[PDB]
Design an enzyme around this catalytic site. Structure first.
Site, PDB file in Angstrom:
ATOM      1  CG  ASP A   1      -5.855  -5.244  -0.634  1.00 18.67           C
ATOM      2  OD1 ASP A   1      -5.375  -6.110  -1.327  1.00 18.67           O
ATOM      3  OD2 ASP A   1      -5.599  -4.495  -0.779  1.00 18.67           O
TER       4      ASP A   1
ATOM      5  N   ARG B   1       2.336  -6.720   0.921  1.00 18.59           N
ATOM      6  CA  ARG B   1       2.239  -5.696   0.887  1.00 18.59           C
ATOM      7  C   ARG B   1       1.340  -4.929   1.843  1.00 18.59           C
ATOM      8  CG  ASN B   2      -2.064  -4.226   1.852  1.00 14.34           C
ATOM      9  OD1 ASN B   2      -2.905  -4.673   0.699  1.00 14.34           O
ATOM     10  ND2 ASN B   2      -1.652  -3.221   1.477  1.00 14.34           N
TER      11      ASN B   2
ATOM     12  CG  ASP C   1      -3.583  -0.220   2.114  1.00 15.99           C
ATOM     13  OD1 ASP C   1      -2.586   0.090   2.553  1.00 15.99           O
ATOM     14  OD2 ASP C   1      -3.467  -0.914   2.043  1.00 15.99           O
TER      15      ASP C   1
HETATM   16  C1  LIG Z   1       0.715   4.331   5.005  1.00 18.14           C
HETATM   17  C2  LIG Z   1       0.829   3.548   6.274  1.00 18.14           C
HETATM   18  C3  LIG Z   1       0.543   2.195   5.344  1.00 18.14           C
HETATM   19  N1  LIG Z   1       2.479   3.656   5.968  1.00 18.14           N
HETATM   20  C4  LIG Z   1       2.672   4.109   6.989  1.00 18.14           C
HETATM   21  N2  LIG Z   1       4.813   3.766   7.026  1.00 18.14           N
HETATM   22  C5  LIG Z   1       3.882   3.922   5.284  1.00 18.14           C
HETATM   23  C6  LIG Z   1       5.720   3.229   5.053  1.00 18.14           C
HETATM   24  N3  LIG Z   1       7.473   3.973   5.079  1.00 18.14           N
HETATM   25  C7  LIG Z   1       7.960   3.863   4.940  1.00 18.14           C
HETATM   26  C8  LIG Z   1       9.421   3.500   5.707  1.00 18.14           C
HETATM   27  C9  LIG Z   1      10.636   3.900   4.670  1.00 18.14           C
HETATM   28  C10 LIG Z   1      10.569   3.697   3.904  1.00 18.14           C
HETATM   29  C11 LIG Z   1       9.587   4.471   3.248  1.00 18.14           C
HETATM   30 CL1  LIG Z   1       9.643   4.657   1.061  1.00 18.14          CL
HETATM   31  C12 LIG Z   1       8.008   3.842   3.789  1.00 18.14           C
HETATM   32  N4  LIG Z   1       5.522   3.709   3.960  1.00 18.14           N
HETATM   33  C13 LIG Z   1       4.323   3.185   2.948  1.00 18.14           C
HETATM   34  N5  LIG Z   1       4.255   3.056   1.591  1.00 18.14           N
HETATM   35  C14 LIG Z   1       5.372   3.111   0.738  1.00 18.14           C
HETATM   36  C15 LIG Z   1       5.614   1.851   0.030  1.00 18.14           C
HETATM   37  O1  LIG Z   1       5.197   1.045   0.166  1.00 18.14           O
HETATM   38  N6  LIG Z   1       3.657   3.284   3.654  1.00 18.14           N
HETATM   39  C16 LIG Z   1       3.162   3.052   4.840  1.00 18.14           C
END
Ligand SMILES: CC(C)n1cnc2/c(=N/c3cccc(Cl)c3)nc(NCCO)[nH]c21
Length: 261
Positions: free
Chosen positions: A138, A142-143, A156
């Site tokens: 995947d 986005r990942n 991911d």
């Molecule tokens: C689950 C793992 C891969 N992971 C680790 N950190 C994050 C993550 N961090 C942030 C950092 C700044 C703003 C926001 Cl909304 C999420 N966001 C997300 N996802 C929200 C937007 O894609 N996932 C994160």
């Protein structure tokens, strides 16, 4: 029995606001309490019964150690009356970052040199994973997450998408690290275009036949032919013809050198 230390005690963990919800699960901010006594900022992924099998994956992933690959910290289980734990990345995912960069107030215009660094990072992360003989399945922008120091790392992976899947996987269900090489080419394009959905004009249900007749992603506007050659090699019809991640990585590094300072 062995991989049981991968599990983290649920009360060492505190959850916060939701950061996003896909059809699968939901990602949340939280605090993990450590050996130190200190707490670490984390992100908590939730999903949903032969379960042991899942736990081994996390056990494996926990073994991954590379600056360009995310480190899974452990898993929690709220008993069905399962959450993976990852370091929080304040800059978020690479895809949303590219989009923000096309707006004022968001991150400055990312110059070519920085777009290449982004790709190198992912090339490196995938190089490592391909050596471990690990299949991602995947890969997309986005990942890919941005570290606090603007390093990109891959996230991911697996955890049980049509425009990122290679012809042969679309056709026969077959999947090898070359299929990941295909996803990487698409990902590179995502970066070159600063967040365009792949294949504008082509709807999802048309994808297999669109590729079957030898059509590919088009070259972005002011993209160097060299960079385009590199991404195109990722989508040659026979998986065997596609370069490997270490072959790719070095091409990007040498290209980055070729650019002015
Ligand atoms: C689950 C793992 C891969 N992971 C680790 N950190 C994050 C993550 N961090 C942030 C950092 C700044 C703003 C926001 Cl909304 C999420 N966001 C997300 N996802 C929200 C937007 O894609 N996932 C994160």
């Amino acid at each position: 029995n062995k991989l049981e230390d991968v599990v983290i005690d649920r009360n060492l963990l505190i959850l916060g606001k939701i950061l996003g919800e896909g059809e699968f699960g939901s990602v949340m901010e939280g605090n993990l309490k450590q050996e130190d006594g200190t707490s670490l900022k984390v992100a908590v992924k939730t999903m949903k019964r032969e379960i042991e099998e899942f736990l081994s994956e996390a056990a494996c992933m926990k073994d991954f150690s590379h600056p360009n690959v995310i480190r899974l910290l452990g898993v929690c289980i709220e008993m069905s009356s399962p959450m993976v734990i990852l370091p929080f990345m304040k800059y978020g995912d690479l895809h949303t970052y590219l989009l923000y960069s096309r707006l004022e107030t968001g991150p400055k215009h990312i110059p070519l040199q920085t777009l290449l660094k982004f790709m190198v990072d992912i090339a490196l992360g995938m190089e490592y994973l391909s050596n471990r003989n690990f299949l991602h399945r995947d890969l997309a922008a986005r990942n890919c997450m941005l570290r606090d120091d603007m390093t990109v790392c891959v996230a991911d992976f697996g955890l049980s998408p049509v425009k990122w899947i290679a012809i042969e996987s679309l056709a026969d269900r077959v999947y090898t690290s070359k299929s990941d090489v295909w996803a990487f080419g698409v990902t590179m394009w995502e970066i070159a275009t600063r967040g365009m959905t792949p294949y504008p004009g082509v709807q999802n249900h048309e994808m297999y036949d669109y590729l079957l007749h030898g059509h590919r992603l088009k070259q972005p506007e002011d993209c160097l032919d060299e960079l385009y050659e590199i991404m195109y090699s990722c989508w040659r019809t026979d998986p065997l013809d596609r370069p490997t991640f270490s072959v790719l990585r070095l091409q990007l590094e040498k290209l980055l050198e070729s650019l002015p300072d």
